[PDB]
Amino acid sequence: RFHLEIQEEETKCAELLRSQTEKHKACSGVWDNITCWRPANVGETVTVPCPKVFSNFYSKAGNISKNCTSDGWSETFPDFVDACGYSDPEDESKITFYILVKAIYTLGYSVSLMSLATGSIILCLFRKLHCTRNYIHLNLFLSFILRAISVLVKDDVLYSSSGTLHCPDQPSSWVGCKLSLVFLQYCIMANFFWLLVEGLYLHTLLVAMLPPRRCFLAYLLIGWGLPTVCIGAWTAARLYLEDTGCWDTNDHSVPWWVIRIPILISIIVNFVLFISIIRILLQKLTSQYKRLAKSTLLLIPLFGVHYMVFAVFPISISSKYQILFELCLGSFQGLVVAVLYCFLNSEVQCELKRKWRSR
C-alpha cells in the first residue's frame, strides 16, 4: 500500500498503446513524468494536478501541462514541486514529535496493562468483595485493559517497520488491519461508557432509596451492548459509504461525528452528574474545605472529567496540545484508577493485610 498505489494505475492504462497504436499520434502516451499519458495529435494537452492517488493538500493546487511536438512531449512547462509540491519544511521536528508521543503513550498503556492485570484479578478472586459496586469496578478495569490491548495492537498492523514493506496485494492483511481498527474503536467506546455507569451508580445510590435488582443487567447493557451498536452504526455506515483503504484516516465527516457524539454525550452527562454529586457532598459537609478538595481530587479520575476540557474548548489551539493532554497525561488514567480504587482502597487493604499475615 505504501508503494503499491502505482501498480494499479499502471495496469488501468496498460491496455493503452495496444489498440490505439494504429493511429500514429505525434505525442504517444509514454510513461513520462510518472503520469500515464495518452497518445494525441499536436495541440492536445490537459492541465492536471498531483495524481488523485495522492490527492494531498500540498499547500497548493497546481497543474501540470506539456507541449505536443513531432517526437512527443518535448518538455513540461511546470514542475511538480513548483506546481503541487509538498513544501513542508518542519518534517525534521514532526518526526521527533510523533515518535516521542508514540513512545510515551505506548509505555503508558503498557504500564496501565501491568497494573490492571492485578487490579482486575484482586477484585475477582476474593469472595468477600463480590458486590455490585465491585462488579462495576471490575468491568471498568476490564474495559481499560481492552482499550490498552486494542491501541497496542493497532500500531503493529499499521506501524510495523520490522517488515520488508513489500506489501503483497492479498487483501487479507487489509481485512486484518480493518478488524484491528474496529476493535480499537469498540474498545474506546466501551471505555467511555464504563465511566458513565460509574456516575450512574454513584448518583443512584444517593437519590433513589430503592436500587432495583435488575439494574445490573441494564448496566451491562449500556456498558457493552451499546458500544457494539455504535460500532455497528459506524462500520455499516463506513463499509460501503467510505470504502477507502485501511481506515486509520478519518478524512470524511460522516464516519467521525457518528463516533464522536456517543463520546461527547457521555462526557457531558458524566460532568453534570459529577457536579450534582459535588453538590450533594457539599450539603453533607456544610453541617470544611480540606476534605472537600480531597474528595474532588479522588473523584476526578474515576469520572474521567479530564476529557471535559479540550473537547468543549475549540480544537483550534494548534490541534496538538490536546494530544499531549490525553495520550500523554490522560492515558495515565489507568494508573490513577487502579492505585486509588484497588491498591489504596481501605476495604481491600483490610484483607490484604490479613492475607499477608496469614501465609
Binding site: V81, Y86, D88, I188, D248, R260, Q322, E326
Partner: peptide, 27 residues
C-alpha cells in the same frame, strides 16, 4: 476521541514521508 486524531496525523505524516522518498528516488 483523541486517539483517532493522533492516528490520523501520524498516518498522514507517514504517507507524506513515503511520497517524499518516492519523488526523491524519481526526481
Amino acid at each position: 476521541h483523541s486517539d483517532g486524531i493522533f492516528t490520523d496525523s501520524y498516518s498522514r505524516y507517514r504517507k507524506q514521508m513515503a511520497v517524499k522518498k518516492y519523488l526523491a528516488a524519481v526526481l
